[PDB]
Amino acid sequence: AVKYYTLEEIQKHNNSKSTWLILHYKVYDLTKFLEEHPGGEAVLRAQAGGDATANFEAVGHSTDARELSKTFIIGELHPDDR
Numbered sequence: 001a002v003k004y005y006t007l008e009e010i011q012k013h014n015n016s017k018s019t020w021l022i023l024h025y026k027v028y029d030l031t032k033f034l035e036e037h038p039g040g041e042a043v044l045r046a047q048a049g050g051d052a053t054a055n056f057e058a059v060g061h062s063t064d065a066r067e068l069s070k071t072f073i074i075g076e077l078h079p080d081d082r
C-alpha cells in the first residue's frame, strides 16, 4: 500500500547521510543519486527536506529523466500536509 510521511519527518532528511525531497506530493530518496545527477549535487542538496516541485519543473526535465525519477519514490506526503 501507500506509505505516508509527514512534512516534519521529511524535513529531517536534509543531509549527506539522507537526502529526501518532495515532487508533486511524492517523496523521493535521492541519497544515492546525488553524485550521478547530471544537474549536479548542489541543486539537490539545497532543496533537501522540502518541496522542490517548482524548481524541478522550472528546469524542464525530459521524459527519460521523469521516468527514471520514479525508481526513487519511497512514499507520499501525508494528505493532511498537502
Ligand code: HEM
Pocket (backbone or CB within 6 Å): 021, 023, 028, 030, 037, 038, 039, 040, 043, 044, 047, 052, 055, 056, 059, 060, 061, 062, 063, 064, 065, 066, 068, 069
Ligand atoms: C527526481 C529526481 C531527478 C532526476 C531523476 C533528475 C534527472 C536529471 C537528468 C537525467 C538530467 C539531464 C537532462 C534531462 O534528461 O532532462 C537532469 C538535469 C538537470 N536537473 Fe535533474 N533530476 C532530478 C531532480 C532535480 C531537481 C529536484 C532539480 C532542481 C531543484 C534538478 C535540476 C536539474 C538541472 C539544473 C539540470 C540541468 C543540467 C544542465 O542543463 O546543465 N533536478 N536531471
